[PDB]
Amino acid sequence: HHAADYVLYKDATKPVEDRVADLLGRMTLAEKIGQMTQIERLVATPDVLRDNFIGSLLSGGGSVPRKGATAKEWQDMVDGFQKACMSTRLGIPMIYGIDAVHGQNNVYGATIFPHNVGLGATRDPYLVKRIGEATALEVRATGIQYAFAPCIAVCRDPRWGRCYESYSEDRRIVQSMTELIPGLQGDVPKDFTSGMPFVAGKNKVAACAKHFVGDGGTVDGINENNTIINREGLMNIHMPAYKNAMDKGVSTVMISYSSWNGVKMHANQDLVTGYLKDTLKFKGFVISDFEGIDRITTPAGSDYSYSVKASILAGLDMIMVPNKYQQFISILTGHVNGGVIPMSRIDDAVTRILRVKFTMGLFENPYADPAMAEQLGKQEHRDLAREAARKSLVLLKNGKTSTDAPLLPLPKKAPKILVAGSHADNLGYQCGGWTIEWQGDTGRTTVGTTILEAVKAAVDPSTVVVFAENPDAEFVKSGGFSYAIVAVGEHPYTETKGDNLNLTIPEPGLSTVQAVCGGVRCATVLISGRPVVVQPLLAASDALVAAWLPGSEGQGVTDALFGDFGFTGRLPRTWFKSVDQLPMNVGDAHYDPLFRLGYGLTTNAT
Numbered sequence: 035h036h037a038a039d040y041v042l043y044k045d046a047t048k049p050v051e052d053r054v055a056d057l058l059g060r061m062t063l064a065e066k067i068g069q070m071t072q073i074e075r076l077v078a079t080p081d082v083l084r085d086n087f088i089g090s091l092l093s094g095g096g097s098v099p100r101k102g103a104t105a106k107e108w109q110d111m112v113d114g115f116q117k118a119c120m121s122t123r124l125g126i127p128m129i130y131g132i133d134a135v136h137g138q139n140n141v142y143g144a145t146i147f148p149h150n151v152g153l154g155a156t157r158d159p160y161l162v163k164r165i166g167e168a169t170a171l172e173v174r175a176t177g178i179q180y181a182f183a184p185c186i187a188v189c190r191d192p193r194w195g196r197c198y199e200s201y202s203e204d205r206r207i208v209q210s211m212t213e214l215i216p217g218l219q220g221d222v223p224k225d226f227t228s229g230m231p232f233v234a235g236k237n238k239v240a241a242c243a244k245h246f247v248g249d250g251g252t253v254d255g256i257n258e259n260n261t262i263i264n265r266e267g268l269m270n271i272h273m274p275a276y277k278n279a280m281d282k283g284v285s286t287v288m289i290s291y292s293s294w295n296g297v298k299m300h301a302n303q304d305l306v307t308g309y310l311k312d313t314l315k316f317k318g319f320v321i322s323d324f325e326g327i328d329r330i331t332t333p334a335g336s337d338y339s340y341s342v343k344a345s346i347l348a349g350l351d352m353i354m355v356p357n358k359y360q361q362f363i364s365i366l367t368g369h370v371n372g373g374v375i376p377m378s379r380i381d382d383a384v385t386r387i388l389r390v391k392f393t394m395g396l397f398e399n400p401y402a403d404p405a406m407a408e409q410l411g412k413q414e415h416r417d418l419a420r421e422a423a424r425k426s427l428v429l430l431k432n433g434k435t436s437t438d439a440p441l442l443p444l445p446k447k448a449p450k451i452l453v454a455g456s457h458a459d460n461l462g463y464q465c466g467g468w469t470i471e472w473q474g475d476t477g478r479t480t481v482g483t484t485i486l487e488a489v490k491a492a493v494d495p496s497t498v499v500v501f502a503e504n505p506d507a508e509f510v511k512s513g514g515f516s517y518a519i520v521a522v523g524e525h526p527y528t529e530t531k532g533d534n535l536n537l538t539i540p541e542p543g544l545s546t547v548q549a550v551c552g553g554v555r556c557a558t559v560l561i562s563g564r565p566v567v568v569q570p571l572l573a574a575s576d577a578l579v580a581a582w583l584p585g586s587e588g589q590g591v592t593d594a595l596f597g598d599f600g601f602t603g604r605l606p607r608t609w610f611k612s613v614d615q616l617p618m619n620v621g622d623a624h625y626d627p628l629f630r631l632g633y634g635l636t637t638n639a640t
């Protein structure tokens with residue numbers, strides 16, 4: 035189609051399938067294997083990217099150009115890597131991925147949305163689609179084109195350190211919240227074929243349904259462990275939302291560290307190829323988890339040759355190496371040169387990678403848009419996060435007896451009020467894991483509004499607000515307080531660090547609640563990734579709210595405390611009476627909850 039030096043795959047007007055086929059047919063084996071290779075920015079240089087024809091880069095959790103980097107800094111980093119990739123013989127742009135799982139959460143100044151369990155509590159799939167839209171904008175503000183989200187794990191045991199990354203123990207809720215996908219990627223066209231990848235263009239990102247499959251079903255909630263369940267249960271609980279994701283054009287699927295009945299997912303041809311590819315008709319690319327192939331073996335990494343063989347034959351398309359690229363590339367090249375892995379399997383992997391890249395517009399817009407930088411932390415997106423935080427809150431108690439005056443909503447005008455607790459003025463604690471650092475952090479780690487700041491911003495000018503982190507009982511009783519707001523709960527955690535068999539909050543937390551509530555009427559705000567042992571906290575408190583991990587916009591919490599909006603959240607998980615009950619999910623035969631799934635008290639706006 036005209037010009038003497040015309041190359042079909044570089045023609046934007048051509049159908050994606052024709053561009054993929056035209057490009058594939060030109061590639062060397064080294065070029066093909068390079069597309070299948072994703073490396074950490076920590077090991078990337080221009081020469082590495084060029085010499086090894088690398089297909090993708092990622093930032094893992096906390097992998098940043100520097101602490102406090104601006105949006106432009108991120109764009110410059112990503113474009114530097116892109117220029118190197120575009121300088122190869124074939125000029126195939128890399129795709130850059132990141133965990134933007136509650137906003138663009140590694141980035142300083144990014145809006146931090148509530149974690150998934152609180153989103154589950156909202157029962158509001160359109161809110162979650164809007165959050166996807168806003169997240170895509172803030173990811174593209176940093177030049178990144180690919181988010182490792184949503185986690186559609188169905189967490190069946192809150193002892194799991196990733197339970198907060200699951201919208202619910204009820205697959206139907208998880209299914210509903212697959213609306214994240216068209217928020218991130220754009221809505222699919224009317225004609226769309228389920229399982230095809232889709233991204234609308236340069237203001238959207240590729241998504242990733244993760245972690246396939248049964249990551250939420252592991253024995254005793256042990257992260258990365260074995261999900262012991264028959265096929266019927268895997269298909270009825272852990273699988274459904276993947277089909278919703280196909281329907282919505284999810285571009286990629288990331289495989290789980292976990293096993294299913296003792297078979298590593300990263301080596302499970304029947305499920306990756308037989309089921310996802312051949313039965314759900316997924317036509318995007320399948321990515322490993324981080325050193326996922328290494329972990330096929332015990333010890334991990336003890337037979338990398340086998341790891342490469344087993345994962346690639348199972349049907350994985352792109353390997354998140356992410357550091358030992360030369361070992362990966364060499365081993366895979368050897369397996370193809372030896373006939374162990376057929377060229378058909380390489381060609382399938384590369385077709386799928388390229389299909390996503392061309393579909394998303396990455397050949398047409400391989401570089402960042404400077405005008406998008408101001409999307410980062412944009413006030414409209416904070417307003418959305420504040421809405422989401424407020425909707426996520428579940429009111430568990432609002433009065434010690436049935437005849438007490440309800441404590442919430444609180445008056446904004448009172449002579450003096452107390453705000454207390456470890457979690458009242460700690461932004462990192464309110465955001466939880468996957469915020470700035472992999473495992474989250476403590477203190478003022480980003481731009482946001484703590485619960486204390488929110489209270490000060492809400493109350494009448496005549497209202498004196500006193501903060502005490504851990505006041506003793508005498509301080510409370512002598513203070514002349516009208517009421518207290520006391521916030522306590524879990525410290526930030528992620529993945530195996532958060533696996534927890536006792537589910538009791540750290541001290542001082544209960545002791546602070548008891549000291550405060552013993553002296554003045556109190557509303558307790560519980561910050562957690564999951565249900566935790568809560569009867570002691572309830573017994574002390576006039577009112578108690580499960581605020582989950584609400585993110586950067588602490589005014590969402592005060593919007594409900596002070597009655598600007600009513601409480602509407604409902605539990606998206608069972609609240610257990612004791613951890614000896616676990617696992618215990620809605621619908622089980624022996625179901626004896628403290629609070630059932632769907633529980634939540636309400637208030638009316640004042």
Ligand SMILES: CO[C@@H]1O[C@H](CS[C@@H]2O[C@H](CO)[C@@H](O)[C@H](O)[C@H]2O)[C@@H](O)[C@H](O)[C@H]1O
Pocket residue numbers: 093094095097133182244323324472529
């Ligand atoms: C301890 O090493 C750290 O692990 C984290 C999480 S592992 C894995 O990482 C993927 C890519 O970031 C996620 O999409 C996935 O959900 C995770 O299970 C990794 O992020 C750090 O880069 C690594 O240092």
